[PDB]
mmCIF file of C-alpha atoms in Angstrom:
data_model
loop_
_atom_site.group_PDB
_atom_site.id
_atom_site.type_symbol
_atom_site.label_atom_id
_atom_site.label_comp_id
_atom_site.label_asym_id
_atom_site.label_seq_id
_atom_site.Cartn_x
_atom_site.Cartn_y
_atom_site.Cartn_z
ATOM 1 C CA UNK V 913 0.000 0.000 0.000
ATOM 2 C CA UNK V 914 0.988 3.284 -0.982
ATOM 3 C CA UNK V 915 0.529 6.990 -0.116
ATOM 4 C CA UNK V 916 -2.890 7.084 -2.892
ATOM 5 C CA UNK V 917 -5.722 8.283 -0.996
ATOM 6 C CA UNK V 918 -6.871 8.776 2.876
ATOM 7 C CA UNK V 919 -10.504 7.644 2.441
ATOM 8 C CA UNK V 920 -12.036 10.924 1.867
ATOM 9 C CA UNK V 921 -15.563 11.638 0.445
ATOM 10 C CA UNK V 922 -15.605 12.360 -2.971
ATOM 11 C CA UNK V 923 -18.070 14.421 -5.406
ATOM 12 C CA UNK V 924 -17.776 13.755 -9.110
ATOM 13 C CA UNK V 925 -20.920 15.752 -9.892
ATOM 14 C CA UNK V 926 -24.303 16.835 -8.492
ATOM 15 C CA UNK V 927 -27.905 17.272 -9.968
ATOM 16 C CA UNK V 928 -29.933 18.708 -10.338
ATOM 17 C CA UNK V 929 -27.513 21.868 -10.629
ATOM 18 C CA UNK V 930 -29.745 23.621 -9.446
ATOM 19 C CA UNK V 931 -32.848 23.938 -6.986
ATOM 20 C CA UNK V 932 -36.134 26.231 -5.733
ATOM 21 C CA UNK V 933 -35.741 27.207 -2.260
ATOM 22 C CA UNK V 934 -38.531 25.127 -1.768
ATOM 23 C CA UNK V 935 -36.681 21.839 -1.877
ATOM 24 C CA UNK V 936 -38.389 19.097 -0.640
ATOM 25 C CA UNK V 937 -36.683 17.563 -4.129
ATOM 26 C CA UNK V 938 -34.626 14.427 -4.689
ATOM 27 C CA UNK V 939 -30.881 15.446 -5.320
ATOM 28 C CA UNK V 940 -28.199 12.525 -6.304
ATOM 29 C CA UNK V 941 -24.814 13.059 -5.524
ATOM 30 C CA UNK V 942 -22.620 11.651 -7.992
ATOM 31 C CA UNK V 943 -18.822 10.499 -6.614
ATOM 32 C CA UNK V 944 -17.253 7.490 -4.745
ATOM 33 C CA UNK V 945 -15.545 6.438 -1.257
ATOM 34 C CA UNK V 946 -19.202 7.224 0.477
ATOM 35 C CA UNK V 947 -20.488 5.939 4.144
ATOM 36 C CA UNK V 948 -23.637 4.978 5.213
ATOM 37 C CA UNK V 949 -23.113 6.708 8.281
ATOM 38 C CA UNK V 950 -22.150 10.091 6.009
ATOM 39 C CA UNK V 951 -24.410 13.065 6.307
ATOM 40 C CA UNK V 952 -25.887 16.230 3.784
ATOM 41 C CA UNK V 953 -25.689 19.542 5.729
ATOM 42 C CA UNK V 954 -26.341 23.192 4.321
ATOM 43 C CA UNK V 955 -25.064 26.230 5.040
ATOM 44 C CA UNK V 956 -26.007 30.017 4.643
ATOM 45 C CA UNK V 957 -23.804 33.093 5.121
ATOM 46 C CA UNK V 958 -24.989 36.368 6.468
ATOM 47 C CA UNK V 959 -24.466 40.093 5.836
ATOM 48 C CA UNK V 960 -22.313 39.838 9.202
ATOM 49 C CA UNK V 961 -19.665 37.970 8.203
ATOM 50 C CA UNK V 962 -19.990 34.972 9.553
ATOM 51 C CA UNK V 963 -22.583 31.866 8.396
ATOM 52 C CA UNK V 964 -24.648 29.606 10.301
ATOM 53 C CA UNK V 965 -27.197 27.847 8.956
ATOM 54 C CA UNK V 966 -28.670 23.999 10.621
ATOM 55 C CA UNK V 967 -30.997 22.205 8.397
ATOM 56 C CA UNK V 968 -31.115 18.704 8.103
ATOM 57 C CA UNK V 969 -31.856 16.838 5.002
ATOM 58 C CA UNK V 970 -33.682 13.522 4.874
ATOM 59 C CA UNK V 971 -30.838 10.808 3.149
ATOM 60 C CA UNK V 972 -32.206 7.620 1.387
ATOM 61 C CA UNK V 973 -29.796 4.542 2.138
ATOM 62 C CA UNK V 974 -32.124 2.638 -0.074
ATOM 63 C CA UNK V 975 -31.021 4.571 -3.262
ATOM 64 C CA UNK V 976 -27.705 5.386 -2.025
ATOM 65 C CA UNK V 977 -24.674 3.018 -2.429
ATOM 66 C CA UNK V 978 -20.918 3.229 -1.872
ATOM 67 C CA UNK V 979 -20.573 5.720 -4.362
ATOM 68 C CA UNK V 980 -23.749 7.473 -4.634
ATOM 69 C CA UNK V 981 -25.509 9.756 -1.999
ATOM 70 C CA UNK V 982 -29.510 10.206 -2.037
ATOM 71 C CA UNK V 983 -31.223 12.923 -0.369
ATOM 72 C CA UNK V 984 -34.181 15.256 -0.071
ATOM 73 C CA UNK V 985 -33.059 19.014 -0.583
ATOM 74 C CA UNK V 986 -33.561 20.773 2.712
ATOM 75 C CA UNK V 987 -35.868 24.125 2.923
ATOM 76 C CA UNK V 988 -34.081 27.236 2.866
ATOM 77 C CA UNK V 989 -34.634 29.761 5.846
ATOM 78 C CA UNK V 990 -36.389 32.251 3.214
ATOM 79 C CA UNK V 991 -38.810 30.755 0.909
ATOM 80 C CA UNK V 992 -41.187 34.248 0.098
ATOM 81 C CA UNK V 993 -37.243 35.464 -1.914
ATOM 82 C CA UNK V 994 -37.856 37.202 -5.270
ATOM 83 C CA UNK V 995 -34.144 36.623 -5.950
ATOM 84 C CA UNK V 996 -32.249 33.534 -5.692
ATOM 85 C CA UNK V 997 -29.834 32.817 -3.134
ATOM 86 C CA UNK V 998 -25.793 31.040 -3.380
ATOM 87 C CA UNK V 999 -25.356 28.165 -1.086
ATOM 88 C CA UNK V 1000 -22.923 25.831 -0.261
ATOM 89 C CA UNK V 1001 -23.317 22.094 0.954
ATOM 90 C CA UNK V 1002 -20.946 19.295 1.857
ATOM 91 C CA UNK V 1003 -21.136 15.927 3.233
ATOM 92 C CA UNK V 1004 -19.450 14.599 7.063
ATOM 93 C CA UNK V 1005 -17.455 11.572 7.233
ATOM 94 C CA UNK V 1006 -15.866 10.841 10.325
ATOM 95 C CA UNK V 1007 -14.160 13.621 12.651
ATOM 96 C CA UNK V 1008 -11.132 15.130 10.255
ATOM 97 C CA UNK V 1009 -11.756 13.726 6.920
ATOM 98 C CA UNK V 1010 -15.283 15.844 5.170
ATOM 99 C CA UNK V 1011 -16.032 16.914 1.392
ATOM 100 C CA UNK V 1012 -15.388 19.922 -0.665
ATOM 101 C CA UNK V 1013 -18.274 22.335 -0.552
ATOM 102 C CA UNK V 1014 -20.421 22.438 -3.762
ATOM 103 C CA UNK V 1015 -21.831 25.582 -5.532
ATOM 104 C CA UNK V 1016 -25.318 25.822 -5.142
ATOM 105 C CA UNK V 1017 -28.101 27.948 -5.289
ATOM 106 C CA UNK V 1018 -31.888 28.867 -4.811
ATOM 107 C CA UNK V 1019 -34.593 29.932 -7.406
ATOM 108 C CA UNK V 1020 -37.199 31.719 -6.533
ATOM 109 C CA UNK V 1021 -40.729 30.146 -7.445
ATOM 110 C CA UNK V 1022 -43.087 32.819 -6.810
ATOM 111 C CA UNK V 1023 -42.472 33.763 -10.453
ATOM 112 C CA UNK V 1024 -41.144 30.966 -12.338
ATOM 113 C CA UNK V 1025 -43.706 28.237 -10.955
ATOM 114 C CA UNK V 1026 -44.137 25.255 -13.636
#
């Protein structure tokens, strides 16, 4: 065994790209060296500086696998936005080792509702 990799989470892609601040959608995250135990958090920064943002989002082990992560797009503080909102997201494995945040962000429905 050589000095290769340190079994970190990995994310190849993610879809949809992008997302309503509704949620409550199913988003597949595409990569490899995943846990069952690994979790989906969100985060939000503020005009202050600092972000801080808990919201929990639902993960389906059923659809899930060793390299694919299943869950249900959390619900983003403000909903009633008429402009969308940049977001980051990453996924917790273990104490030290933890994935690269992903560029997300919020459309507004109010408008565009299909």
């Amino acid at each position: 065994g050589s000095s290769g990799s340190s079994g970190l989470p990995q994310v190849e892609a993610y879809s949809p790209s992008a997302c309503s601040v509704r949620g409550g959608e199913e988003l597949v995250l595409t990569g490899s060296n995943f846990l069952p135990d690994s979790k989906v958090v969100f985060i939000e920064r503020g005009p202050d500086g600092k972000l801080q943002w808990e919201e929990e989002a639902t993960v389906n082990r059923l659809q899930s696998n060793e390299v694919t992560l299943t869950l249900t797009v959390p619900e983003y503080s403000n909903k009633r936005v008429s402009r969308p909102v940049q977001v980051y997201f990453y996924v917790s494995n273990g104490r030290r080792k933890r994935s690269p945040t992903q560029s997300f962000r919020f459309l507004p429905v109010i408008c565009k509702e299909e």
